[PDB]
Amino acid sequence: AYQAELGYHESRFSENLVMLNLVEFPDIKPGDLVELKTYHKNPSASNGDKKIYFIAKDFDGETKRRAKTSNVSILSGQLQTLLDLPSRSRIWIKLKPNKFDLQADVVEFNIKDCLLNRGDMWVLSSKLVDTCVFMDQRLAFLDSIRGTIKGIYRNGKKIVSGYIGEQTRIIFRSESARLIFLIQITDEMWNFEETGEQLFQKMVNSFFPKIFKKWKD
């Protein structure tokens, strides 16, 4: 493992999420998958330690020229709030070289309040290759479509961040969709269950209000 100093930068300099100094620790080539774990042995949950995957990219010319330590720079916004670390802290770096073996199995997505075609989903998934994502990251397609990565799965574990490869089964769940209900009105609707409730009474008192409350939540 390696050691690096954490840094933050605004969107004016660079648009990438995580940037590291390529001139320091030159074991890492420009195109790699690099862990950003903040723990060196004995991981702590109460203290707060996370393993955030990302893809290596070099510093901006303006930032590298007018530099002030900070071997690794994280773009502000959502990733900084997820990591929750001060402006100068101690982090660690690995060089996991198995991109194929570290592919996430299922990456979720949300397409709320916008119509994506099936081919649009295919194109958006094609653009999301060799790029690492994390939970609740607002991806953008055509500068108007908004996404939300609500779940990354790998070997039965819901990892906070994962790597999306060629063989990643990325799904596109819809948070704003057309729904059709087909209620059967039969002779059994006025029948009574063993507790003492009619089935249509259940339908109008416990299924629909709960599903509307859940949909609103």
Partner: protein, 280 residues
């Protein structure tokens, strides 16, 4: 750099003025409100000297009410504002957005931007860039918007950025703000992103400092506030109404040594700031 506040009646210009400036170039001067109702504009009714005397024009749009006519009136204002002087920075504030979701706020801002761009395309104006800010009185947004508006009217911005970057790099400072004594409008900072939580901490530190000083008067403001984890918050009044607020982390060092080196470095920075006429 006198900024002009324009908007429809009951949009919130007077309340914004009260909240900000009541609680030249850089100081918080007496800004000019302007109630602009829907009408036909008189051609050159001795308003050329007024708009030539405005450093940057600020427009206020109420997000609660219908705003298409507001955008149309704004386009009519810009149609002669850019013609009279092509060096005026034009700012638009989307006020009263406290009770809206993030998605609704972004969609409203995008719709306002598209409508303003299309209306300026219809009027034939080219080479004009209009900034948009989502502002509200109840939070920090109006302060940050006015900070950006003021920063657009200081020609010595990059040199102050370099000076603060050097000061932070040689004093173990986490984040240093060059505030002003009134309105809590921070004038310059480093290349580090402006954290909202740290900005609110520094603003309430300014309020606590000014109030505690005002409680004991009638006998150069300096303040050191150290927390439990060793993190200190420093204050030192600069030239004219400017005040420097910095958050310095000890990094496992002596508190008094850090205070001494920070005091000497900040005094050197103030001596350097004496040469440049950034005050007032």
């Amino acid at each position: 750099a006198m900024v002009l506040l324009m908007g429809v009646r009951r949009c919130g210009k007077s309340s914004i003025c009260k909240v900000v400036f009541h609680n030249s170039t850089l100081i918080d001067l007496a800004v000019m409100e302007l109630p602009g109702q829907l009408n036909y504009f008189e051609p050159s009714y001795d308003s050329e000297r007024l708009f030539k005397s405005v450093g940057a024009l600020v427009y206020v749009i109420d997000s609660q009410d219908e705003y298409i006519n507001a955008i149309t009136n704004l386009a009519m204002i810009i149609e002669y504002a850019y013609k009279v002087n092509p060096s005026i920075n034009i700012e638009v504030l989307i006020h009263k957005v406290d009770g809206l979701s993030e998605d609704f706020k972004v969609d409203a801002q995008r719709d306002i931007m598209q409508r303003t761009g299309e209306e300026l395309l219809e009027l034939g104006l080219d080479g004009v860039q209009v900034s948009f800010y989502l502002t509200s009185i109840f939070d920090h947004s109006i302060y940050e918007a006015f900070s950006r508006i003021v920063q657009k009217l200081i020609p010595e911005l990059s040199f102050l950025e370099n000076m603060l970057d050097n000061l932070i790099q040689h004093s173990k400072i986490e984040k240093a703000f060059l505030f002003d004594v009134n309105s809590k409008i921070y004038v310059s900072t480093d290349s580090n992103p402006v954290d909202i939580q740290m900005y609110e901490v520094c603003s309430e530190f300014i309020d606590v400092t000014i109030d505690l000083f005002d409680l004991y008067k009638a006998p150069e403001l300096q303040n050191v506030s150290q927390l439990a984890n060793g993190v200190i918050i420093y204050l030192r009044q600069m030239i004219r109404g400017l005040a420097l607020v910095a958050i310095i982390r000890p990094n496992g060092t002596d508190m008094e040594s850090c205070l001494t080196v920070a005091d000497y470095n900040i005094d050197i920075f103030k001596k350097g700031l004496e040469d440049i006429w950034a005050n007032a």
